Structures are given as C-alpha cells and as structure tokens.
C-alpha cells in the first residue's frame, strides 16, 4: 500500500499559510529517495534525519503540512527561525525531525489582475508554539481601546494578502511548501520506506 503523497503534493489548491493544512500518514510505504532526487522541488532540506536514510527507517506516524508563502519566506520554514511566517503563521520546533520541501508555484497561484486569496497573519499578541494553527479573524487591539469589530486607529485586521502577480520577482513569487515530520513513540512503527 503506497502512501498518498500525490494528494498532498499535486493538490490543485493549497491552503493559506495561516490556515496550514495537516494530513496524517498512518500505514503505508513510499520511496523518499525518489522524492528527494526529484527535480520538481527547488528546496529539500531535512533535519534530524538524513534524506537518503529515510528509505531504511520506520516511524509511528508522519504528518504532511502544506501551505503557500512567498519565495524569500521559505527560509523561515526551518528550526529556530524568526519572522512573520515563523512567529505568527507556521512554526517549526527546535528538535525538528523532518524535511522541508518547496517549489515555485507562479504558474498557478498568480492571476492577471493579482491573486489576493492567499493570506498570512500580520498581527498577533504572541508568537505561536511549534505546530500551532491560528485561523482567528479578531480585530487586533493595538491599544487599550476595545475595537468591538471595527477597524481603525489601533484596530487592525490581523491578516494580510499576498500580492501574487506574474510580474513579480523570484522572492515575491508564490512557493508551495510541504513539510514532513516523522515521529516514533511507544506505538509500533507504521509509515515506512521500501527497505524496512
């Protein structure tokens, strides 16, 4: 039984980074080396494990997190990084054991007028814990005055849209991201490569 990574990687539409999806991988197998040596991805960095050793190892569970960010923000998808995406949208732990995969998505997530449907969190009262999702849309209270749902002075909508246009540069272009995380607990190993 082959693990359904095609559902994650080749999904037609991707989630906003603030509402990043997470798919569970329960019991199946897959050849990570084929994914590693694939030219489709511009970034494929692993942490806590060797990308080539993944075929011989087995874990209790694997998670596939998918979202869309800008090019120059892919570096924030790493352990111990800071910035709008790392602090307010998607945060990786310091002991991350997984791989960060990303590719340029300009042909899809860019419209002639400008795709404004992908967003990120700009304001937040505190930083996210690792693997935390916040999809709230409360008006951010910058001062001591309650906003009561009204935007204005010291009262800002917490989300901001990416200006994804075809005329943008590589940094200001959309990049689809898939983050695999491998966990092993007291439960039996479950998701595997072909070697084991």
């Amino acid at each position, epitope marked *: 039984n082959l693990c359904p990574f095609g559902e994650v990687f080749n999904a037609t539409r991707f989630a906003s980074v603030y509402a990043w999806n997470r798919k569970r991988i329960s019991n199946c197998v897959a050849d990570y080396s084929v994914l590693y040596n694939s030219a489709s991805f511009s970034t494929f960095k692993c942490y806590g494990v060797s990308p080539t050793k993944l075929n011989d190892l087995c874990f209790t569970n694997v998670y596939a997190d998918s979202f869309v960010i800008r090019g120059d923000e892919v570096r924030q998808i790493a352990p111990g990084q800071t910035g709008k995406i790392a602090d307010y949208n998607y945060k990786l732990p310091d002991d991350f054991t997984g791989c960060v995969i990303a590719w340029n998505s300009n042909n899809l997530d860019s419209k002639v007028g400008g795709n404004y449907n992908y967003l990120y969190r700009l*304001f937040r009262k505190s930083n996210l814990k690792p693997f935390e999702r916040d999809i709230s849309t409360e008006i951010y209270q910058a001062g001591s*005055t309650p906003c009561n749902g*009204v*935007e204005g002075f010291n009262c*800002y909508f917490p989300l901001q849209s990416y200006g994804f246009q075809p005329t943008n540069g590589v940094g200001y272009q959309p990049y689809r991201v898939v983050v695999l995380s491998f966990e092993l607990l007291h439960a039996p190993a479950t998701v595997c490569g072909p070697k084991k």
Partner: antibody
C-alpha cells in the same frame, strides 16, 4: 528619546512634487501608526492621511487621493509623505504624528508630533 | 463625512477664570476617537485629551474632557497665562475621513 524628526524646509515650483520624511526614535515604531496633517499660516489643521506601520495600509482624505502617497521604511523607522502636482494652496507647514507604543501596547491618541516641515510652492 | 464645529470662535477670558470650549459633530461619533489639541502660536500641536476624557501624560489637572455622542467639551478649570492659545478637536474614528475642527482661540480679556 520619544520623537519624530522631520526633514527640512522645501521651496518647490508649481506642478512638481515634494517628499517629506518623518524619522521615529525612542518608541516601538513597528507597532505604531503615522498621520500627516498640514496647516497654512494662521489657518486650521487639515488632515491628509495616515498609515499603519506594521502593514503599510494607507487611507487618504479624498481631497488628496489623486496626488498624495504615504509610505514607510521599516529599516530606518521613517515615514514619508509625497505630494504631487504642487499648487499654491499647498503652501503650509506639514506635520506627522504617531502614538507612543511599547512592546505591549500603543497609546490611544496621537501624542508624538514632529517639529513640522515648511513647504513653499511658488514660481 | 463627519464635520466638527468648534464654538466659540474666540474665547476672551482672564487668568484664573474657567474656560469651556465646545466641539460639535454632524453625526454621533465614538468617544474613544475624539481628541483635543493645544497649539501655541509658533509651535506644533500638543495632545491634551484622548478618548474624550483621558488626559495625556504630563497634562495639568486643570484640563478636563467630557461629552458624548455629538457634543464634546474641553474645560480649563482656572486659566494660567500659558493656557491662552488655540485648541482643536479631532475625530479619528474608523479608518477614513478623519477631520479637525476649525479651532478655538483663547485670548486674554481686556
């Protein structure tokens, strides 16, 4: 500490543009917002527009929507106001203003004011 | 389009007297976004009151803000020589259309 310092005076000829700077220090500029106001000599205060430092989102008085731009530079903690197609009626002192902010909270009014920038439009 | 009308245009009083300045709005506005400013002839505006009734840091106790809805008041309980200046109210509610009043001059009666 705690100040907005504006650029020096300007003498501009009609039809040209002017860009006034407003550099912040002594407070958490990233959390704040900057409004721009002008005043002809012996006249009232006239609201131009404002910008949210964190987002860069701007809102202008419709009187200036056609020829004003308010921006900000995070790296230098500086806010800018650029007025184009300058007319004689644009001769005034231009002020920026912002609430003091800390790491936790912003003040609930515009309590930090720049020293003002004189802009003279004339041939 | 919210308009702020200040009255009187000029206030002619003596040091030690009570000053009562008025700011009327064409619609009801939130008290949380009405402010009072002082401006001496050569200097920049200076925030006195925010949120209709809150004194800014360092403003003397004799300055007081009150009102709600459309009628807002700045009171100076007993005028000091430095208090004789021009006062503006400002509405900064919502994200657009902020306006000032035309200003009230507080001059020395003679």
């Amino acid at each position: 500490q705690m100040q907005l310092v504006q650029s020096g005076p300007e003498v501009k000829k009609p039809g040209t543009s002017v860009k006034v700077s407003c550099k912040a220090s002594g407070f958490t500029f990233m959390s704040s917002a900057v409004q721009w106001v002008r005043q002809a000599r012996g006249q009232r205060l006239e609201w131009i527009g404002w910008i949210v430092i964190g987002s860069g989102n701007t809102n202008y008085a419709q009187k200036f929507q056609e020829r004003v731009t308010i921006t900000r530079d995070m790296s230098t903690s500086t806010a800018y106001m650029e007025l184009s197609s300058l007319r004689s009626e644009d001769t005034a002192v231009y002020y920026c203003a912002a609430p003091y902010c800390s790491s936790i909270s912003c003040n609930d009014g515009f309590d930090i004011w720049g020293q003002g920038t004189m802009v003279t439009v004339s041939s | 389009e919210i308009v702020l009308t200040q009255s009187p245009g000029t206030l002619s009083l003596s040091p030690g007297e009570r000053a009562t300045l008025s700011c009327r709005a064409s619609q009801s506005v939130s008290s949380s976004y009405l402010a009072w400013y002082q401006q001496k002839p050569g200097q920049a505006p200076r925030l006195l009151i925010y949120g209709a009734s809150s004194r800014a840091t360092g403003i003397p106790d004799r300055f007081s803000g009150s009102g709600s809805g459309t009628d807002f008041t700045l009171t100076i309980s007993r005028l000091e020589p430095e208090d004789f200046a021009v006062y503006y109210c400002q509405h900064y509610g919502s994200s657009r259309g902020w306006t000032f009043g035309q200003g009230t001059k507080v001059e020395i009666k003679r």
